[PDB]
């Protein structure tokens, strides 16, 4: 809808060049795409992600326009996040789906994403390895040879992400400044 569309001529001339280098698409009429949105806003001892509903609405509308059917889960702990991931991997609609999206949005550290009851005394963490391990071929064979996009909005740490250095500063002319001896 609000996403610029690929015309049939454009899509067919794209499909011509790298036909085997491109994942195949199940025709829209009978295909049933799926997607998952997990988002944590309220926490026990971690501040609340004010503005998360905006992202939920936007990503839901995007995955709708992309031909996927979104299922949103909100305010889960580590175990409940894992269990909803299991349930999503067990959805029989993946058997007739050509792809899927997994969008996780919460706080986080390097080890992983934060659960609802996360705390430095009682941590609630979902590791980077865990999602890949649960959505793989051995646990979700319904998506074998199918793209699985995982979008993660979280902090991978507590650092600023930037670094500051000094950066100040051959025509034969004269110096234009005044006030030298300062």
């Amino acid at each position: 809808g609000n996403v610029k569309l690929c015309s049939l001529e454009e899509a067919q001339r794209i499909w011509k060049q790298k036909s085997a280098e491109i994942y195949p698409i199940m025709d829209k009429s009978s295909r049933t795409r799926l997607a998952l949105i997990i988002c944590n806003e309220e926490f026990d001892s971690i501040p609340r992600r004010t503005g998360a509903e905006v992202d939920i609405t936007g990503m839901t509308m995007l995955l709708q326009n992309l031909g996927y059917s979104v299922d949103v889960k909100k305010n889960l702990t580590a175990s409940d996040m894992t269990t909803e991931l299991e349930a999503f991997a067990h959805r029989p609609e993946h058997k007739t789906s050509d792809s899927t999206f997994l969008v996780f949005m919460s706080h986080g550290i390097r080890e992983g994403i934060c659960g609802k009851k996360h705390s430095e005394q009682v941590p609630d963490i979902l590791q980077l390895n865990a999602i890949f391990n649960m959505l793989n071929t051995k646990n979700c064979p319904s998506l074998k040879d199918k793209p699985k996009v995982i979008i993660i909005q979280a902090a991978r740490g507590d650092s600023p992400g930037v670094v500051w250095f000094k950066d100040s500063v051959x025509x034969x002319x004269x110096x234009x400044x005044x006030x030298x001896x300062x």
Binding site: D145, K146, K148, I150, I152, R156
Partner: peptide, 8 residues
Amino acid sequence: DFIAFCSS
């Protein structure tokens, strides 16, 4: 056929 996209 996996791909991850982290916000940072």
